Design a protein around this ligand. Structure first.
Ligand SMILES: N#Cc1c[nH]c2ccc(Oc3ccc(NC(=O)CN)cc3)cc12
Ligand SMILES: N#Cc1c[nH]c2ccc(Oc3ccc(NC(=O)CN)cc3)cc12
Ligand SMILES: O=P(O)(O)OC[C@H]1O[C@](O)(CO)[C@@H](O)[C@@H]1O
Ligand SMILES: O=P(O)(O)OC[C@H]1O[C@](O)(CO)[C@@H](O)[C@@H]1O
Lengths: 440, 440
């Protein structure tokens, strides 16, 4: 039972003594079907879910039928394009949906994609029967996500927040765009057949998000990924809030250029901790949850706030294994092969008896799920942990993630707006060393 | 910002220089309300959910009204006790429910309990209004779990599996007990008012488990624990299956009495791996998922099976930190304080730069959730990991968990039956060292 440890990821694999003529061999993908009237947050759900799935390592892509339409029909004039009696535009819209499905097939069967989010109204049983036929013929699973809401306040808010600012309404003022969009919604209301898990859609795998996540109808969750999506949708919310992310104040290891360890705050780190308390106070937040790692430097930083805080072992810095408490110079001199391997593949590289950024993502997933549930949160953590969390909020790839700039004594203020996060950086005017290292 | 590291758990806490007269200060608990007709799996849900919640560290207890009734009324005669026209038994049954609620108040407000599972029919709005009044007056949260099923095959199967074997039917044969139980169910059908999240129960936090988990109605999930319960209920199933748990075959570190590391199989370990393949083959399982850790010894064991397997970093043995690759004699001689601290508090003890059994539980929770989703699974792991998983399946406490017997070259065959697991041990007749150490 001869095994070898892969140099980058440190995975034990069978020793592969390929024969004279080495031969390469060259689970089922899922089509997530968005369902609902316009301004029901389908694009918001599509984008957020795709961001989460990609971050956890499930290759996911959104196919928005409206973008195929904006490409086929140069400029948008009015709701008249969406009229059920508009024979020509109805043909164009069908062609756009079919062209998106063609790209869904290519993504899942030929590009290594695992999940395709089909972002359209898909309000009629006919359209959904056609998507099911497409899924069955291509051996793709189908999972439906319907967003149902009758509240006019919610509809008006969605139009104001992200519809009026759509490329379709570039030449329009807020009032014209709102009026045109209401008429556009009305075009879909007559033919709209909601999902019926009771009789018609009984055998379909679906989630009905009712009244902006107040209630859920979950039918036939087949697998792990659908179960995860359902859990995610139940944990996220659209309530306004702020996420503050920062590292512990400068520590003794930072001064010596040493990685890992459990060293305490330097004199400057203690100054940052005081500066952070003043900053937090000036934010005047009704309630604020404070999260730290179990490492001393983040706890000492939180201690300066005089606020209750919760320690998470999942927030502990990346484990450097045998390289813990060493400087990067000592790593290069004692472990040159290891140093070069990491520089070449920073995301997947695992330290011996240690971790990779890939392991960090797996550890941080419960942190992300809890961050989603919460409102105002301050996370006091570490450089690699912060890059991973930031890659989730900022939709950064696995390749970009180990190189994100997360300086010491700097708060990253995250405000959820439109289809992602607005990021503000706040340097708290306390000197520190620089721990950022660019690629080679 | 002076901190000290707690000796057992290794948690950084503010240095507590208590004044001359040290003063001690001396989230809201939840009442989970089971709802539904008899033989709807309410006790099955109650017990399984309690087992999971306790294992993850949420103190949980079941209060079954029927057990209070068996205590108040010595012997059970027939369904006549459950008649709606039985004035005396109706008073007794109410007294029993009130006595259970009294014990719910004492458990949550005075015993450090976090979750009380109120296991009764609670089929009428009147009973549920009374439970809500009790929850509001005691500042307890209320979360309803209703099990709805109209399938007579499911009802008959439940009566045959766990009702006929109830202490109520000790003097009865299978046919008498089944007949009496059907009449007993009928006593509840007239007054049964299902949960109505649409109109009446709109503001209640609830889950409706429809048709043995085929469908779910989820209303107003308020917090983290309710969200976790909902996710758990969506991942478990009642399909028949087998869980096989074993350790890797004996390794080189086992022979030297060394802890941790990433050593390979000894000659005996390789013999076990072959013996395991023969055992697996003899089980004649249509499909079998094989899970290993990322450590060499478990992968080499799986390699002998000639079956596809999946490596989980979450299955890696407990991290001994600074004590890794040391013998227990070398631990006692180099770290005597650490050795004695662990012996005194084996569950909570954290190795320096390492883990506790408490950390293992947190790491293994996604493993447990996936084990629940799956059918036939073989987990090839390590001594401490195995004790943790076994404590989940066998409902063992945190205190018992570090001392569970998990010998090498022995398969633990777990068969879900009634309200837990039947455990069969299969020694594969290959000698090894003993790594079990009893408490002192
Ligand atoms: N209708 C409608 C919506 C308008 N904007 C939205 C944004 C998101 C959206 O979808 C979700 C909203 C809420 C949740 N979950 C929860 O609120 C559970 N706490 C999940 C998805 C619906 C709409
Ligand atoms: N009615 C009825 C039941 C009879 N025995 C049962 C055992 C468990 C039970 O509750 C659950 C069954 C199933 C699930 N979940 C799933 O099957 C999702 N895969 C959750 C709870 C209902 C009944
Ligand atoms: O992935 P990188 O760039 O080495 O950064 C992670 C490192 O940053 C630090 O947080 C500070 O230098 C170390 O403890 C950790 O090893
Ligand atoms: O908690 P205990 O009894 O020390 O057992 C855990 C130990 O068992 C082993 O799996 C085998 O000795 C070690 O690798 C590990 O440290």
């Amino acid at each position: 039972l001869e095994l070898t440890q892969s140099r980058v990821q440190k995975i034990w694999v069978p020793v592969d003594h390929r024969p004279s003529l080495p031969r390469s061999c060259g689970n089922s993908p899922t089509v997530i079907v968005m369902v609902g009237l316009p301004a029901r947050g389908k694009t918001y759900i599509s984008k957020k879910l795709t961001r989460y799935l990609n971050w956890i390592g499930v290759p996911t892509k959104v196919f928005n039928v409206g973008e195929y339409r904006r490409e086929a029909v140069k400029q948008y004039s009015s709701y008249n394009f969406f009229r059920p009696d508009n024979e020509e535009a109805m043909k164009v819209r069908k062609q756009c949906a079919l062209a998106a499905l063609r790209d869904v097939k290519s993504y899942l069967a030929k590009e290594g994609g695992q999940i395709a989010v089909f972002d359209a109204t898909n309000t009629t049983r006919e359209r959904r029967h056609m998507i099911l036929h497409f899924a069955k013929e291509n051996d793709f699973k189908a999972f439906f996500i319907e967003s149902v809401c009758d509240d006019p306040t919610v509809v008006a808010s969605n139009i104001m927040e992200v519809k009026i600012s759509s490329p379709d309404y570039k030449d329009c003022n807020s009032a014209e765009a709102m009026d045109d969009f209401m008429k556009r919604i009305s075009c879909y209301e007559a033919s709209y057949q909601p999902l019926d898990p009771d009789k018609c859609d009984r055998d379909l795998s679906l989630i009905k998000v009712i009244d902006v996540g107040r209630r859920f109808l979950v039918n036939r969750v087949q697998d792990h990924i659908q179960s995860r999506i359902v859990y995610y949708l139940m944990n996220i919310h659209v309530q306004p809030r702020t996420i503050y992310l920062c590292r512990h104040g400068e520590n003794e290891h930072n001064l010596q250029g040493r990685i890992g360890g459990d060293s305490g705050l330097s004199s400057r780190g203690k100054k940052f901790a005081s500066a952070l308390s003043k900053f937090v106070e000036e934010q005047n937040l009704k309630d604020l949850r404070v999260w730290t790692s179990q490492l001393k430097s983040t706890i000492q930083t939180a201690e300066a706030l005089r606020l209750p805080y919760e320690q998470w072992k999942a927030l502990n810095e990346i484990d450097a294994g045998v390289c813990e408490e060493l400087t990067y110079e000592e790593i290069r001199d004692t472990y040159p092969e290891e140093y070069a391997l990491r520089e070449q593949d920073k995301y997947y590289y695992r330290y011996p008896t240690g971790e990779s950024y890939q392991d960090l993502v797996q550890r941080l997933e419960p942190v992300i799920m809890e961050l989603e549930r919460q409102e105002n949160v301050l996370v006091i953590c570490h450089q690699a942990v912060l890059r991973c969390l930031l890659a989730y909020f900022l939709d950064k790839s696995a390749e970009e993630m180990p190189y994100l700039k997360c300086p010491l004594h700097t708060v990253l203020k995250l405000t959820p707006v439109a289809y992602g996060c607005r990021v503000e950086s706040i340097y708290l005017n306390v000197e520190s060393v620089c721990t950022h290292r660019e690629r080679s």
